[PDB]
Design a protein around this ligand. Structure first.
Ligand SMILES: Cc1cc2nc3c(=O)[nH]c(=O)nc-3n(C[C@H](O)[C@H](O)[C@H](O)COP(=O)(O)O)c2cc1C
Ligand SMILES: Cc1cc2nc3c(=O)[nH]c(=O)nc-3n(C[C@H](O)[C@H](O)[C@H](O)COP(=O)(O)O)c2cc1C
Ligand SMILES: COc1ccc2cc3[n+](cc2c1OC)CCc1cc2c(cc1-3)OCO2
Lengths: 216, 216
């Protein structure tokens, strides 16, 4: 390895449209989206996976105006993942999560399920009621998923780039997200880079650990 | 392979204090922290890596009150990583970032360096001025780092648990973070699980893709 993956992966600046993910890789990227951890296993997210030319064109509309520099990446990659966060944490979602954990066999007694729900609601209530920052809390979980995802697809031997440079209002409208309870946060094209990928040859750059890291 | 890692890793609930990271492992986890991607390569973060008894005890003060259920994880794990975000994006940091990229060989001409600085400011200015969401934006990059980190350390064969159940006010004060320009967001003990980790054998649970994922 993973350290070689972390040291070798890069944000692809141009994708080769003739190179598609294998069907097995297309299944594997969905497994990575699904199985990321999240606070309280709340999983406050939705994913749009666009692999058709028609689907990628709808996403790529959000890369207009100042964001045109990202439009080619969304059009030319094999698959394009739109990471969305819930806009609100409702008690029906909270019920969905604890019932799924029960179906999966994580509770020995109904008292353990009850205690799991109560613990989750203490955190949800802290964010919804006391802090009124639940929207930001869930978005943070989505960014955590993205980070898991970017390392995972690199480890699969796939190129990708994370994109914030897009119009989320246009993307949300295009897919009806506001009415369904979600908002788009990061767009991640996945596929294979082309000869036009000028970043595929540049050395990686990071600030040194003597600036960013304190050992104690 | 990385998919096996994603399906088999877990949030460790109790650590064996006698099982330390090897010397190479301690260096590798710092490489994972450093080499995470971030928007504009802004790297708006600081990490505290606690591996001494005193250092872990200091981090573990933050797991008081309602959060005692996370305190033993911090005391017992080999290393405890504190992920911090910058509290404001100042132009001295932006300069450090582009100068480092320059030092690493990423600009062919001074016009390319100047072009890189200009784009980074467009995004930094959009957040600090137009959106007034500067702290949230950098906090999102830290969560992305955490997501990368958790998958990396699992791929290294190390146990870990991300922790939000801590008092960031106490942790920030314990380490003088506010005055240094940072705030703590998530605590990640890393090491090896013990027999008391009730989560190491439980099946993993996630919502079905027919709820969370749309194909287009
Ligand atoms: C951002 C974040 C914060 C978390 N905080 C805690 C915590 O304070 N205490 C704890 O026991 N687990 C914590 N977890 C562990 C999650 O509950 C766990 O990720 C979730 O149930 C998914 O299970 P898994 O990580 O084993 O796959 C945290 C996870 C995340 C992603
Ligand atoms: C238009 C565009 C938008 C980007 N948005 C993001 C983003 O939102 N988050 C992110 O982590 N990286 C983003 N990146 C890539 C980062 O610049 C990149 O991760 C960083 O410079 C480190 O390089 P690496 O990813 O190649 O290691 C974007 C790149 C482009 C071209
Ligand atoms: C269904 O089993 C589950 C499912 C989800 C679980 C989630 C958590 N725990 C057990 C869980 C468990 O059972 C072991 C332990 C306490 C905890 C603190 C947290 C957290 C998640 C959890 O995120 C924020 O701080």
């Amino acid at each position: 390895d993973i350290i070689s993956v972390a040291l070798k992966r890069h944000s692809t600046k141009a994708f080769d449209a003739s190179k598609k993910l294998t069907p097995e890789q297309a299944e594997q990227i969905k497994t990575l989206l699904q199985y990321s951890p999240s606070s309280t296993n709340s999983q406050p997210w939705h994913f749009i996976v666009a692999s058709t030319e028609e689907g990628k064109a709808r996403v790529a509309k959000s890369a207009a105006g100042n964001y045109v520099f990202n439009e080619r990446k969304m059009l030319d990659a094999s698959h394009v993942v739109v990471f969305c966060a819930k806009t609100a944490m409702d008690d029906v979602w909270l019920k969905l999560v604890v019932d799924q954990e029960d179906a999966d066999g994580r509770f020995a007694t109904p008292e353990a399920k009850a205690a799991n729900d109560k613990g989750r609601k203490f955190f949800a209530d802290m964010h919804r009621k006391d802090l009124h920052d639940d929207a930001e809390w869930m978005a943070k979980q989505v960014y955590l998923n993205v980070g898991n995802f970017l390392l995972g697809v690199a480890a699969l031997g796939l190129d990708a780039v994370p994109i914030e440079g897009f119009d989320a209002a246009i993307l949300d409208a295009e897919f009806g997200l506001k009415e369904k309870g979600y908002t788009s946060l990061v767009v991640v094209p996945v596929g294979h880079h082309s000869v036009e990928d000028f970043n595929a040859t540049l050395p990686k750059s990071r600030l040194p650990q003597n600036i960013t890291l304190t050992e104690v």
